[PDB]
């Protein structure tokens, strides 16, 4: 037994008693803030939140007296790793206050930075209203190129200096926690150590991501070539039919999701998509029936009822009056059998689907309620939002909709509607996987020093032409920080959790449709009325983090690593259809074409032949004098030939 083990076990027993009653108070005070926005309620959760944040730092230093080399129990050892990790407490005193100032500066530049119109400089647009609605709605080439560039440049410069400092620091925090760099710190969520054949290194994730990406690359090239052909009809004389796509024409500000190109790229535009938003009005479905239809969806597969206090304590419907609340759809795990759902539910199709999505998190949280407190989470960072998306995937099928009451029973779906559905999925699912892969591959190489600080923006657009297939419309030097203009980069968030969530989502779906004895294609599958499929899901749901995630995958899919063949079986009716539409077109892209390339003038300077000795060095100050000499030459030509006064600068 060894005293050590006993001591640890006890310490954890007295810990979980005093953690559960104290975390319940910090969560209920935050629930009362978000349903009831009062400035009384702001510091109601801030003194209760700091009672929690200080309680962890007391109990972290008490857990250092139990080293890990002698603990034989794995449940006890797993809670000690979550509690002994130092975090940002390992830094200096003035460096830990310097790091929190940089993080608060970058998140304030992102949310409060604005962009002003050039011809009317009194109207300035923030990002989240106004500048996002330009890139999502406009079809004008010059208005999309303006927003992009502008926002880019500004936020760029800002996040630049701060970003550099931050990168420099976060590495010291990771190396003092016995990691190689900060990229190795982020991959520690997937690390499994010594569970007798279920192990997983932190460097095996880079190999498993690059191996599974090379099988998406045939499907992505046919989707990239089909979008390029349909974009040439909306922007003629702007997109080369063998080159990359311009970065500002991709549906939003960064090109993360291609879902706003559906109105330009729809394969059969005359056939409308399956929408049940009007039959829910004609059957008078309020924001209690669709949660009762969602609850009976889960009891059909064998998952239990709701917890009988879920209906009383909830926020299923908006107040509407002066009583204010925040409407982001979240599931809550307050503690001691308290599970609450907060969303202002409309009567629409997607709020019927988001009700199935958010109740997937509640059925996940209701399963591992018997676990210890530190093991009440997903098996890694991808499992949580993957279970919540296979619930909305099955609930949006027309086989499920026609048996719930909507979608009148003499309704045969067309095989042109299924291609209209599969392309709207592939613009969001497949269209984000080369963006998610390239961004984490750029950040992993910056953190470990494989990319020097004078080649950050050279390697960013070299990787976008090669991996993503997206070209910049304006050349960006090392004064910009275009990756930091995304929310997850400047607010310190791990981005690999969106790649692995996409791969687990279809691995879970294919493993559940075989249990439910599904016959047709994968994208028409339902898991409802199948108890033997809910049994395969609940055996992973009840684990939490008590078992490794490689063992949690084998409880569902029968494998130990993440696989990409279930993703390609989902988009198999689309992939055969895309190979027929790209018979004449060119599949692939060349990384040499550029939107500014046919108007460029190449300058070649040979300094040591005109001077030899007494020849000056060509630094960045000489490039400033060249740009002012060309700007002088353009000013004289427009005055002496065209009689116009155009003030060209060196920034033009």
């Amino acid at each position, epitope marked *: 037994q060894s005293t050590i083990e006993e001591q640890a076990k006890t310490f954890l027993d007295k810990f979980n008693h005093e953690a559960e009653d104290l975390f319940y108070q910090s969560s209920l005070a935050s629930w009362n803030y978000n349903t009831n926005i009062t400035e009384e309620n702001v510091q109601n959760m801030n003194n209760a939140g700091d009672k929690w944040s200080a309680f962890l730092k007391e109990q972290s230093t*008490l857990a250092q007296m139990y080293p890990l080399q002698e603990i034989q129990n794995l449940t006890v050892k797993l809670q000690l790793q979550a509690l002994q990790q130092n975090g940002s407490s390992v830094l200096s005193e003035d460096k830990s206050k310097r790091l929190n100032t940089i993080l608060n500066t970058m998140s304030t530049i992102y949310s409060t930075g604005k962009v002003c119109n050039p011809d009317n400089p009194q109207e300035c647009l923030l990002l989240e209203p106004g500048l996002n609605e330009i890139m999502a709605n406009s079809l004008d080439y010059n208005e999309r190129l303006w927003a992009w560039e502008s926002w880019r440049s500004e936020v760029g410069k800002q996040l630049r200096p701060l970003y550099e400092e931050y990168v420099v620091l976060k590495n010291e925090m990771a190396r003092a926690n016995h990691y190689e760099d900060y990229g190795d710190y982020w991959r520690g969520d997937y690390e499994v150590n010594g569970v007798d054949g279920y192990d997983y290194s932190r460097g095996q994730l880079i190999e498993d991501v690059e191996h599974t990406f090379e099988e998406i690359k045939p499907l992505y090239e046919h989707l990239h070539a089909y979008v390029r052909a349909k974009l040439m009809n909306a922007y003629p004389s702007y997109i080369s039919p063998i080159g990359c796509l311009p970065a500002h024409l991709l549906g939003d500000m960064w090109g993360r999701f291609w879902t706003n190109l559906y109105s330009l790229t729809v394969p059969f535009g005359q056939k409308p998509n399956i929408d049940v938003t009007d039959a829910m009005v004609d059957q008078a479905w309020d924001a209690q029936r669709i949660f009762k239809e969602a609850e009976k969806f889960f009891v059909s597969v064998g998952l239990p009822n709701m917890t009988q206090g879920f209906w009383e304590n909830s926020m299923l419907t908006d107040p509407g009056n002066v009583q204010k609340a925040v409407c982001h759809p979240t599931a809550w795990d307050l503690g001691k059998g308290d599970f609450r759902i907060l969303m202002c539910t409309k009567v629409t199709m997607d709020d019927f689907l988001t009700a199935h999505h958010e109740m997937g998190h509640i059925q996940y949280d209701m399963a591992y309620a018997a676990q210890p407190f530190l093991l009440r989470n997903g098996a890694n960072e991808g499992f949580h939002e993957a279970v919540g998306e296979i619930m909305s995937l099955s609930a949006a099928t027309p086989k499920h909709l026609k048996s719930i009451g909507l979608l009148s029973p003499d309704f045969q779906e067309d095989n042109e509607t299924e291609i209209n559905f599969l392309l709207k999925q592939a613009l969001t699912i497949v269209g984000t996987l080369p963006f998610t892969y390239m961004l984490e591959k750029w950040r992993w190489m910056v953190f470990k020093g494989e990319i020097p600080k004078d080649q950050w923006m050279k390697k960013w657009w070299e990787m976008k032409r090669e991996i993503v297939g997206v070209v910049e419309p304006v050349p960006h030097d090392e004064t910009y920080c275009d990756p930091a203009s995304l929310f997850h980069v400047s607010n310190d968030y791990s981005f690999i959790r969106y790649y692995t969530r996409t791969l687990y989502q279809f691995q879970f779906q294919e493993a559940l449709c075989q249990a439910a004895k599904h016959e047709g294609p994968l994208h028409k599958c339902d898991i409802s009325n199948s108890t033997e499929a809910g049994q395969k899901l609940f055996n992973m749901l009840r684990l939490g983090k008590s078992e490794p995630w490689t063992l949690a995958l084998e409880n569902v899919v029968g494998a130990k690593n993440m696989n990409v063949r279930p993703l390609l079986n989902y988009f198999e009716p689309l992939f055969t259809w895309l190979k027929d539409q790209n018979k004449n077109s060119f599949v692939g892209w060349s990384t040499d074409w550029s939107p500014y390339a046919d108007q460029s003038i190449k300058v070649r300077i040979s300094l040591k032949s005109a001077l030899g000795d007494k020849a000056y060095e060509w630094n960045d100050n000489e490039m400033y004098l060249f740009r002012s000499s060309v700007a002088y030459a353009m000013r004289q030509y427009f005055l002496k030939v065209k009689n116009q006064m155009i003030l060209f600068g060196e920034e033009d």
Partner: antibody
Amino acid sequence: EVQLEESGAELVRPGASVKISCKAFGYTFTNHHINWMKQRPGQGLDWIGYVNPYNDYTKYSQNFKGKATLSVDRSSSTAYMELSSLTSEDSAVYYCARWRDYDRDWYFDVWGAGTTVIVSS
Amino acid sequence: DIVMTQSPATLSVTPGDRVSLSCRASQSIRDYLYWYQQKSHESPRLLIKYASQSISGIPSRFSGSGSGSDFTLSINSVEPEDVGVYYCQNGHSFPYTFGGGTKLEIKR
């Protein structure tokens, strides 16, 4: 100051059950495990087990499982040791001792004075 | 479980003498023994925290040494009132089996 209090030099008829009480003083209480040891006269010590006052959790050595039970009253700061099926062999000085901390340092600090338990009719 | 043995069994050393008392281990007890001084008709006290660290309130000359499986309680120029049965406790295994015992007599 920190003391532990014992109770009774109990003479019991063999075959019956006994009640050994250890009263606390000074330190809090529900913040230090309470152990028990047996010492035969003219012999070395050996271990009975312990009762955690928090969580009422007990642990025993293998020679005493099913022989003695351990209880505790949080409202009165008394710990109980109760042996049952008393033979002629369980005739020794019984010490109640705590160790400090709760999970940190697992070595004894302060002791009782021993309750002499004699088994004879 | 672990059998804790004491290398002497009885000493009768005169005062003013530097002595050494050894508890040998059984398996691998990594610096987790504790030395106990028990006088006659009393409750034992503490002598050594883990292997050489001392409890405040003890007089001087009480020092432990060694680790792993060999330990030595060292008394230097003993007192006339340093009599009693000097035990050694265990760490690792839960059933902390108390050592044998080493009585301390005097006279020459």
